[PDB]
Amino acid sequence: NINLFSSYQLGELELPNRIVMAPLTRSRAGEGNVPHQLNAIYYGQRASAGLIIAEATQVTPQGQGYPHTPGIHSPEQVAGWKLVTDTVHQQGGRIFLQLWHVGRISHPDLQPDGGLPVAPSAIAPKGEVLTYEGKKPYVTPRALDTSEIPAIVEQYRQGAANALAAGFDGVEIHAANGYLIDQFLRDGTNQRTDEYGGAIENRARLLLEVTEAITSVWDSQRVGVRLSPLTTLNGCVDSHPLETFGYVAQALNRFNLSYLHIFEAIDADIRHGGTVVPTSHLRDRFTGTLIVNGGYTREKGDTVIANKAADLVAFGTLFISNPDLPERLEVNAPLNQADPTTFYGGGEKGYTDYPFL
Ligand SMILES: Cc1cc2nc3c(=O)[nH]c(=O)nc-3n(C[C@H](O)[C@H](O)[C@H](O)COP(=O)(O)O)c2cc1C
């Protein structure tokens, strides 16, 4: 009778419970997009998680899309992240870094030399993007040349190598929420006519090449992949999500990965006649560890573990406000209410000052 509090063997790591801290952008990086002591305190406070997945962290300068997110491309960033991994390990926790490239979801003001964001296809996102000077309209990204795809893969490989030097326990490839890899996956954002567009094997190719490069740096059971099959975030939608995401789930088996992590869009059920990609479909086609996420509670997490629908359950919002979420869920304590006004940017307030039980 396994439940959220059951231990789990994730490759060589023994997780003390099945509760994962989802990756959460908090936009509190210092100069040079470098993590600092306050970020180490924040993650250390949450080290009772079975596994922490750190916030999305750009693998290269062009992969930044929002002010003050941390990177994993410079020696100063590695040193700052080692403060974080040192603290988490001292607290007896485990932490993976989520490796990011935002693709088109950026602005020239955040790019080297004020250049265009890059993407599979030159299709502007709708609406506005935050810059240092304030909100501005998006521009149209540059479509990468076929010859530049190896450079993207190499940027991910280097980000993964830097994460290894920073003392992480593993890495998660951010292939969700409409960022660069997801832009290639989904046909709403990828109109390419080379071997990276069109057929599903072509749209999946960037993710698979990135995965192969990263599993050349890390043992493969320390590499996870995140997908979000039915999100509409960032204007990124696929026309045949069951076929697309079911193909990816099966295609990842041969890499012997740490896990596949699914963020189940919060409106998946109401935004269709029903969910067009039940997670069961992905559970059936990926044979490894499955993390599920999106609106989970103690009740719902225990149910999915008991029914064998998932192995691990990641919590986002609740881990912002409850540093000791595992203990609170275990003893059925009150939960602190998250304050969205301090999710992104700032200092201690709404970051390290949510109380323990
Ligand atoms: C403030 C905030 C920042 C987030 N940043 C990231 C991120 O860096 N990477 C990611 O893959 N998802 C990110 N997400 C999505 C969360 O990981 C999670 O999937 C989502 O909030 C749903 O889970 P929940 O209902 O447990 O919060 C973020 C969500 C929030 C609320």
Residue numbers in the entry: 14 to 370
The publication says:
Out of the crystallization conditions resulting in crystals within two days, the following were selected based on cost efficiency and compatibility for customers and the environment: 25 mM Tris–HCl, 0.1 M NH4Cl, 5 mM CaCl2·2H2O, 50–150 g L−1 PEG 6000, pH 8.5. X-ray diffraction analysis performed on crystals taken from µL-batch experiments revealed a crystal structure with a resolution of 1.27 Å (see Section 2.5). Based on the observed intermolecular crystal contacts, nine amino acids were selected for NspER1-L1,5 mutation. They were selected based on their distance to a potential intermolecular interaction partner at the crystal contact of <6 Å (except for Q263K). However, for the NspER1-L1,5 WT, no crystals were visible with the Tris buffer, and a lower number of larger crystals (compared to mutant Q204K) grew with the HEPES buffer. Its concentration in the liquid phase remained nearly constant throughout the process. In accordance with the protein concentration measurements, no crystals were observed in the crystallization samples of the NspER1-L1,5 WT after 20.5 h of crystallization.
PCC 1720 ene reductase (NostocER). This oxidoreductase from the old yellow enzyme family (OYE, EC 1.6.99.1) catalyzes the trans-hydrogenations of activated alkenes, demonstrating its industrial relevance as a biocatalyst. As OYEs are strongly dependent on cost-intensive NADPH as a cofactor, Mähler et al. engineered NADH-accepting variants (NostocER1) by exchanging NostocER loop regions at cofactor-binding sites to ER loop regions from Achromobacter sp. JA81 and Acaryochloris marina with a higher NADH affinity. For this study, the NostocER1 Loop1,5 variant (NostocER1-L1,5) was selected as an example protein for the rational introduction of Lys–Glu interactions at crystal contacts to demonstrate the impact of rational single amino acid exchanges on the crystallizability of proteins and enhance protein crystallization.
